[PDB]
Design a protein around this ligand. Sequence first.
Ligand SMILES: N[C@@H](Cc1ccc(O)cc1)C(=O)NS(=O)(=O)OC[C@H]1O[C@@H](n2ccc(=O)[nH]c2=O)[C@H](O)[C@@H]1O
Ligand SMILES: N[C@@H](Cc1ccc(O)cc1)C(=O)NS(=O)(=O)OC[C@H]1O[C@@H](n2ccc(=O)[nH]c2=O)[C@H](O)[C@@H]1O
Ligand SMILES: [Cl-]
Lengths: 416, 413
Amino acid sequence: NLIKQLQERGLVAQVTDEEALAERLAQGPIALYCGFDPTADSLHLGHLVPLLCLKRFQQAGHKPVALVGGATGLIGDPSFKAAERKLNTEETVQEWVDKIRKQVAPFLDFDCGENSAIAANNYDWFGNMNVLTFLRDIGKHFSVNQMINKEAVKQRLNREDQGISFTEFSYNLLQGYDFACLNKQYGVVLQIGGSDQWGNITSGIDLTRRLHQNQVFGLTVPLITKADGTKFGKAVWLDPKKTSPYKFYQFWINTADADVYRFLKFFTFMSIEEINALEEEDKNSGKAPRAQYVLAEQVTRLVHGEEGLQAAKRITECLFSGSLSALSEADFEQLAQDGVPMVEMEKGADLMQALVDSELQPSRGQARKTIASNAITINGEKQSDPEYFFKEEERLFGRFTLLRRGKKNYCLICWK
Amino acid sequence: NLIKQLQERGLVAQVTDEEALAERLAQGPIALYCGFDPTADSLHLGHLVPLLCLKRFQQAGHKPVALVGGATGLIGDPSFKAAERKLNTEETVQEWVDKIRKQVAPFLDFDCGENSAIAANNYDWFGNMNVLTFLRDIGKHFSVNQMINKEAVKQRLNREDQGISFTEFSYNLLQGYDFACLNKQYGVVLQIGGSDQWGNITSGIDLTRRLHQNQVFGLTVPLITKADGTKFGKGAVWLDPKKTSPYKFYQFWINTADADVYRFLKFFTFMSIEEINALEEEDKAPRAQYVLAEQVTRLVHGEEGLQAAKRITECLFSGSLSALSEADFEQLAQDGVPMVEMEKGADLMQALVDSELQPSRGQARKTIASNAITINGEKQSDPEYFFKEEERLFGRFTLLRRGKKNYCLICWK
Ligand SMILES: N[C@@H](Cc1ccc(O)cc1)C(=O)NS(=O)(=O)OC[C@H]1O[C@@H](n2ccc(=O)[nH]c2=O)[C@H](O)[C@@H]1O
Ligand SMILES: N[C@@H](Cc1ccc(O)cc1)C(=O)NS(=O)(=O)OC[C@H]1O[C@@H](n2ccc(=O)[nH]c2=O)[C@H](O)[C@@H]1O
Ligand SMILES: [Cl-]
């Protein structure tokens, strides 16, 4: 029972007519979909849970359709958003559509027979749809009375100053019609998404009934919350030019103990039995948990590949050990991007001024004392001379020196 | 000052930035518009007040644009309407558009130089507009918080069972864009309509500022109410003679209450305000109801219509029917007097029973013998009488009257 398997992983928030859907899944393969709007040049970790759920359905023999919102991205989803978004240009949205489509594709199998994945774009049917056709054929089936009362937009109708445009208010209809289109085009009978999408999904179920006289289903995945109550992202992009593999890997390494097993269930393809054995091992080891290391390895390999995972571990190992000889120029570029705090400095700066400019020390007088106390390392090597100037060999690849005050305060000097 | 002149006739419900509009009108001709949606094959008396208002602006030298809602008629205006309307087909709406455009055209001058009237249809811009273009270029300028607070749709936003579809809720944006579109195409700076249109007009004023950075204005005419509190023109009083005959039209006006007659001359005629006031004091039989009937009937149905209406009225009052033509009897059968269809050979007693002028043959016999019945205005007191062929006027019609005023028209099969 796929729904029950997803429920044990904590991956089912809500499901329409669960018995009928489970009966349909057990009968044979179904086609299902999940949509992703282009609001940026990359997806982030928030988008990964439903994307990986498409794969989980596919591994059970179902056919996933990954829709990218070429049209909906020109409108903007208001669902549980406190503020009206500015409209994006057609040129920017198209550039983002191509990037997202390409980023999504490796997570799904496009070559596994009948249930091979399908890439879809709702601009195909909205780009040539007349406004009177939309208002009459689609709009007549929507009650404004019900629409203004949906949880996703109700808060936006409290104050005019923090209100909602007719553009964003119409979004629900567009996503509604997409479900009817995919049902007609590919026999799609299930739509999945995060729990904020419930109302957009159910409008599609109701419209598919009205337009195509077909019974279709909805299933949502919970939005991730941490046990402490704080917000999940602290955003973590899938694109390495936005969030380096090192920072990505470190984010998972630093997962709280109360979230690590749930995150393994949400973000990995490890069996429930293995995750339960990992939790049990951590419970009776007599040591701190090792699950964070397993979670970091799994998700980093999934998103950034074996090469990305090895680069994340090599940077982590070098930063910890102090020995930087194993680092490449590309590794230092991850560090400069977002790995450790960084500063740009003109070559010839003494150690004292590097400490002040890097904000590792408030003044040169303070810098002098901390150097003399043997609290500073240069590329992991201790340097106790206050009057010290860096040697040309300490500027790695001619432009990198890593300063560390104590055991954990880093600043990468990027020489100009 | 034209606004002052309209206020004196009681034709101004509301007006935006009034000093500026009066100033714009005073410096020279403006282009203005009023829209009419196709919800039937004819306009009715309710539509006459803003229609004549376009002509009142045109006489003052302004350029009227008469818009027929070929696109808006496919959506449906919910303004102050208690219930959602069913969608009409594209084929039906197109038939109504052509009938309404042709009914409006004689009320305005399409050949008077610079200020010649223009017929417009919003299907010309909405019929091929892409949905994303509409939602982005127009929809972004509309606040749902503001829309749900418009007086015209409030009664519809309390309960789902007396609710509003997304279709009718989007209407306000189409009428809003129409004003912006007419401002760009023809330099239209004023929109008029009845008071129910206030919110649709003010949305157009706001959108024109947002889209074209132009200042435009709105003016509404009051919805006609009676002194007694009842509904005006109550079914409806249509402009189409095949729906409401010129006789029935004329009679409706003759029977206007004295408390409404002077206000109605101001709203429905081109008579000067000086003339109407002079007519008001003089009544302290009033000739006003007769003057109102004469003016509006001539305006809608022409001199030929007015003469037929007067000719039928006169023949029914006198009982002398020789002046009635075949077409006059056709007006009587349509809606002029109660009518009953009958097979030729029916006796007088049967005609009185079938027409419901008498409850039984035995009673009809007593009524006929009492000299209460006229056949085409001639007394007939033989209870056993059968109609003569010459009494079937144009081989089709016989008018019975019981007593001094109860008529029934027999239409022979
Ligand atoms: N309206 C959806 C995209 C969509 C869906 C179906 C269509 O037919 C058309 C468009 C939307 O705006 N999605 S999203 O791009 O913001 O996110 C994609 C998915 O990721 C989930 N998500 C997003 C952010 C987050 O932190 N957590 C989360 O689960 C959302 O619920 C959605 O299912
Ligand atoms: N929404 C308007 C038509 C319209 C106007 C402007 C546009 O850009 C597009 C469409 C509408 O539905 N009008 S109506 O066809 O119902 O009536 C036409 C006019 O007659 C007035 N009217 C209607 C009935 C009545 O009893 N009294 C009255 O004054 C209305 O206020 C409107 O100005
Ligand atoms: Cl006879």
